[PDB]
Write a protein that binds this DNA or RNA. Structure first.
Ligand code: GFN
Ligand code: GFN
Ligand code: MG
Ligand code: MG
Ligand code: MG
Ligand code: MG
Lengths: 487, 247, 487, 245
DNA sequence: ACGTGCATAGTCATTCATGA
DNA sequence: TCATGAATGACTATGCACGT
């Protein structure tokens, strides 16, 4: 039996736990804004073919695929993570298209795994766009059987768009969601002004990203906290719901709340008001009624007494309830395996860098493949030019190896090209098919020229990011939900 | 007559309505936590209340009364309906003039219906006699046209009919997404449940009628009673002709 | 609102429930001895490739695959069914190879889905043998997307081997497990004596099937109940565990129980004795100690008092505990969609009939496929004899449609055959490659003749069933576990 | 001598030996692992106490709340000894307390939470060397013809593989080397032959040298002060590798 | 009254950091 | 004290038929 000192054990064990939670659980990678479980769920569904071009698969199949290949943990919590990514009040831009009961903004829990179905959304398809073209580094999974991606291509700035919240060890993150069109403008600027320093970049990006855009709409009051978050990486952003005063024919004024701030439980909110009125903390209120429905959305009617001023009661609601509540921004993300608090100009720049990497890697891959096919095509054209001779040679061979070896001698060919000639069908010996082979060579040589040009010119590379992203935003971009007002 | 609805002495599972008038109120007794959850969301909270029931209901024909009254699900039903049972039945205290039983279209939904109807017929018969009991018919299919509004079908025949008509009308469907087939209420969301089983202007309800009480008494005892032999011979005798009951 | 009478509703609904439960849930199909959930689990795993020729897949993947394609029910209970099929003390011949914690014969529950892995056993591979050769009818699944098998090939008598127990409506089944080698002998006899009547067949089969063979070993006392079950379809079979009396250095005696009868919970058994001791029912017992382990198996030590007789205490144990307990046999199975209580000769005969169906259908499938291959090969051979013309024809054709249409006219060939000529690779134009096409034709024509011969002779068909089964038994057959003694 | 259950935790699968000096308590992570352990153990001398979930941090949590925790009560009750000032080592029901958790990081975390409970409530158990740590296997080499071998590290895996191949043995490239990701994935046999068989198990005895230094480290790592912990990790995690070099 | 096996998931308690 | 969100699943009750 070996002896171990308690200080040695404690320090090593706790540090190993803390570091894994920090880098590999609770905090998002800055490039795609994803935690490990998120990335693994999405890739599992992707590889399984659970895409928008086919009907929803049973969500149990996504959980089991993620569990069995990539995420060595429980089926219960993995399902929770998948479900959250499908809720429109949780994600500003949902990554999972859910079919069935996925719960509500209140205390209505999601249906069990057996009842629900799921597939990837079109935007989630942009997260995984061309991932199979060596655009990101892959590593072996938890048991060496298969490969998994270290990061997704993420062809739209997902970290800033959908945000992130996570509790780690020694630190925590809380990044709010943003409007995609505003983020795109910032990226477009960063691409054009690629040489601008941080001071200019921060000023520019802050001008285009007006503030967080929550899926739950509501209001942002003030501009100080927003400025702090972008300039410091920390800031307190005051949120408010929407209140509309309605008058009755009898003289019974009532407050109608139709929106609430981000991450405020509807049922808890109603209960909080109800409990604060029973004990006596919000006088002036006469009656609370939830007239909400699937057809009118949120609609909490708060009838106030006749000897009460509406604005007073509203301020009391701001004071003693989450009708007014602050978002504690802490822009913490993993950068190159290291946790870092980032300015807004740093977040944009790091994403733009990732995109440029993705485009260059894609181009290199396509260029390699283009050369390979061109190489084989060059072989085919040689065969076509001497077609009469090619056949006669293969006929007299005892094996296919003698036929091949001859082809090399006849036309000056590789082993790959000669093999490709051998595998050739009589199908392609028709007139148009022979011409198709010729034109295909001409096509690829044109593509190779284009591809080589891209690699040699950073200008085009940046151009690609801009144009492709622009296409994404035009298709999947939406209006702002959260309204920004002054003090 | 009016009675108070719970808002922050009734079952915890009950999602009561807001209307205090029983004549205007409805109780949807739902199968499963998921389905009840969706119903709670898609309902009209003014007049429609939801009481989800979990698992197969206890057979009041086989089990002794004391055991039945200890069952949490039975207590929920009796308590929510407000009326007593047996001799202490008082229809005046009925909290809902519409008791809609809503179960899956599958075979296990049918079984839960017979167990609930047995509870009602044995403990609270006047509810059936006065036409306060109904059966909701869930949809089986949802046709998702590419450009037109989606259509719901409550049988294989209607599915074929709506499909034929729409195609004849020049509409089109994906052969991938296409026709969604429901295998239970739990697979539906809030909107779908409203537009097929809870919207009073579109819902397909069946009102349970009681003609011959003595004949009914016998059938309940045969099918639900402790006598297995009687039940076995009844099934082997009559299952052959279940198709031809309405021909 | 439509009116419906309560009598119509009750009758229609309950009958619909009862019949589906009878035919499609609780009771086994006579041909493969499987309930729907069993069949659907096995086929799901089979189709997924979770076979003994590969490492165990996470059992969560098997459950989700079963749920998503075939069995529209809960994941929880489906996992239970899968777990049962992997327990050596439940199934006489396990169909699932389990890896991890699958519970124990006591109250120790199996580990959760997340912890365990599973794959098919070699015998389960015989259940599904050649299922892809149209040996069984397939039907669309619960939503029409995919096909599922109505019954498995079941190349060994699984119903009698593993038995079955099920609670339906108006009836229930309880078939005990049997020894594969004894069942095989019975099958071998039924095949040889294919014209024997029920009277003779029953006498023969009862001679070879000596009685049930439980996975938990133990003892069968008497022969009447066994004879009743086989002649009537109902019988009470008396089971006993094995007790070995041990003496001590002091001279104290103790009873050692190392086996218990089928389906007796070890922990409940120990608890029952413990409660019947204090309850002053089983005097003479001094101490109860469970000395069981993973290495010695069951070992319940019952130390008895000095003024106690071993057999008296043993007889008391037989009387007042499940150390002696009877198996209530009720040979109920679904035959052609109808529940039927069956004699032993009926069970064997119906299984033999199924096998013969499988072998004929397989032969028919192979014969059809052989003709197709032969048909195309004949086309290729025609092309080779006029190869100079064929090539010249395809070359001079502007399209492939022109080439095809020409080939039919040139060689007097079908379109399928002509298509095959077009799909032919330049490889197949080599000397030795041309020769293989000829030989392959000669090869297949021999195979076709053989297959036609099998279909024409019932003797061969029966011969195949015998020979193939014999191979299975020699490979997977084991010794008898349950010992049969007289009164 | 002490009575074994046949007034203790319901989760406890006690041993049969009435001698604490020979008795052992395996504190296990999870219901699955504890279940298999209960089967593969030697029921004579080895008892199993499965613990469910993350253990409550007695450094952060208030005293009364810790005493309400079902898992803590199970440990305190099973060990027989009191806590703090009412600690009496004479009533120790097992002279060997083996903590057995998954090889993963969450197992390591549960170890630090248990060690914190012991050090703060029942320190003498550590001082007198009654606390041990079982080292689970990481790999199982499944040779085609030979008996299987277990490995407790990546290095040992490479070594046993190298030796076996050099000896002429062979492995499947499909089944091959099974990698354990937790105690819950193991069966009864596997646990016995790697962590519970006293002639093969790899135990580490927790020793306590400097009590004052330990006291500070526990308070830094497990205390409510985040800043102290944050700076400690960023300061020392860089050199966690080189603690035993 | 208990076992059997295929059918009909929510509740329960902790770590961890931060702000009410 | 409570919410956040990924991490570490056993227990609870009915139907149905049958035998002790
Ligand atoms: C048994 O421990 C758990 C508990 N509880 C149950 C009651 N005692 C406490 C100590 C743990 C829980 F209240 C929820 C979960 C879960 O929600 C859960 C999951 O996978 O989601 C896993 N576990 C167990 C330890 C892993 C949970
Ligand atoms: C909620 O109903 C269930 C209950 N109980 C929980 C509380 N008392 C009764 C009402 C039902 C149960 F004690 C076990 C299960 C299960 O074991 C189970 C399963 O999937 O195996 C499914 N369900 C629910 C209704 C379907 C179960
Ligand atoms: Mg949980
Ligand atoms: Mg259902
Ligand atoms: Mg269950
Ligand atoms: Mg673990």
């Amino acid at each position: 039996i070996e002896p171990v000192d308690i200080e040695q054990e404690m320090q090593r064990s706790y540090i190993d736990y803390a570091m894994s939670v920090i880098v590999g659980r609770a905090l998002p990678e800055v490039r795609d804004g994803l935690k490990p479980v998120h990335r693994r769920v999405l890739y599992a569904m992707f590889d399984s073919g659970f895409r928008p071009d086919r009907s929803h698969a049973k969500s149990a199949r996504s959980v089991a695929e993620t569990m069995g290949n990539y995420h060595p943990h429980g089926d219960s919590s993995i399902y929770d993570s998948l479900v959250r990514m499908a809720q429109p009040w949780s994600l500003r831009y949902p990554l999972v298209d859910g079919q069935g009961n996925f719960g509500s903004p209140g205390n209505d829990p999601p249906a069990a795994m057996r009842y629900t179905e799921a597939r990837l959304t079109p935007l989630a398809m942009e997260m995984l766009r061309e991932i199979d073209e060596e655009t990101v580094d892959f590593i072996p999974n938890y048991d060496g059987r298969v490969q998994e991606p270290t990061v997704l291509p993420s062809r739209f700035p997902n970290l800033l768009a959908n945000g992130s919240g996570g509790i780690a060890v020694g630190m925590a993150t809380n990044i709010p969601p943003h409007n995609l069109r505003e983020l795109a403008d910032a990226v477009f600027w960063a691409l054009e002004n690629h040489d601008a320093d941080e001071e200019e970049t921060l000023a520019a990006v802050m001008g285009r990203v007006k503030g967080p855009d929550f899926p739950t709409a509501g209001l942002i009051v003030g501009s100080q906290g927003t400025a702090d978050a972008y300039k410091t990486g920390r800031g307190s952003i005051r949120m408010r719901g929407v209140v509309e005063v309605e008058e009755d024919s009898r003289g019974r004024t009532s407050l109608v709340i139709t929106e609430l701030p981000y991450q405020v439980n509807h049922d808890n909110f109603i209960t909080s008001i109800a409990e604060q009125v029973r004990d006596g903390k919000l006088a002036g209120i006469s009656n609370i009624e939830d007239q909400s429905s699937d057809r009118v959305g949120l609609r909490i009617v708060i009838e106030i007494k006749r000897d009460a001023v509406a604005k007073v009661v509203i301020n009391n609601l701001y004071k003693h309830t989450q009708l007014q509540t602050s978002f504690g921004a802490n822009m913490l993300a993993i950068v190159d395996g290291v946790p870092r608090t980032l300015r807004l100009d740093q977040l944009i720049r790091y994403y733009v860098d990732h995109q440029l990497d993705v485009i260059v890697r894609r181009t290199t891959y396509r260029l390699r493949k283009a050369n390979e096919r061109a190489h084989i095509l060059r072989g085919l054209v040689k065969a076509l030019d001497a077609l009469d001779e090619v056949i006669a040679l293969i006929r007299a061979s005892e094996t296919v190896d003698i036929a091949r070896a001859g082809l090399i001698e006849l036309l000056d060919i590789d082993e790959i090209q000669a093999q490709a000639i051998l595998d050739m069908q009589l199908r392609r010996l028709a007139a148009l098919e022979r011409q198709r082979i010729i034109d295909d060579l001409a096509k690829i040589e044109a593509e190779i020229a284009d591809l080589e040009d891209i690699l040699a010119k950073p200008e085009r590379q940046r151009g690609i990011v801009r144009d492709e992203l622009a296409e994404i935003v035009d298709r999947h971009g939406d209006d702002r939900r959260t309204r920004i007002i002054a003090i | 007559n009016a009675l108070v609805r719970r808002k922050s002495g009734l079952p915890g599972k009950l999602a009561d309505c807001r209307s205090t008038d029983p004549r205007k109120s409805e109780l949807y007794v739902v199968e499963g936590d998921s389905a009840g959850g969706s119903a709670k969301s898609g309902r009209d909270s003014m007049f429609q209340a939801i009481l989800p029931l979990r698992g197969k209901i206890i057979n009041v024909e086989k089990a002794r009364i004391d055991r039945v009254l200890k069952n949490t699900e039975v207590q929920a039903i009796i308590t929510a309906l407000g009326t007593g049972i047996h001799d202490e039945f008082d229809i005046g205290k009925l909290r809902y003039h519409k008791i809609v039983l809503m179960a899956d279209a599958d075979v296990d939904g049918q079984h839960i219906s017979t167990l609930l109807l047995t509870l009602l017929f044995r403990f609270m018969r006047p509810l059936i006699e006065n036409g306060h009991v109904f059966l909701a018919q869930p949809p089986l299919y949802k046709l998702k046209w590419q450009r037109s509004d989606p259509e719901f079908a409550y049988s294989d025949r209607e599915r074929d009919g709506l499909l034929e008509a729409g195609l004849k009308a020049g509409k089109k469907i994906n052969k991938e997404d296409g026709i969604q087939r429901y295998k239970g209420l739990g697979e539906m969301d809030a909107k779908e449940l409203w537009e097929t089983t809870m919207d009073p202007s579109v819902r397909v309800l069946r009102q349970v009628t009681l003609d011959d009480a003595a004949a009914a008494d016998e059938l309940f005892s045969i099918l639900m009673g402790e006598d297995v032999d009687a039940r076995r011979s009844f099934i082997t005798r009559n299952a052959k002709d279940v198709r031809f009951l309405d021909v």
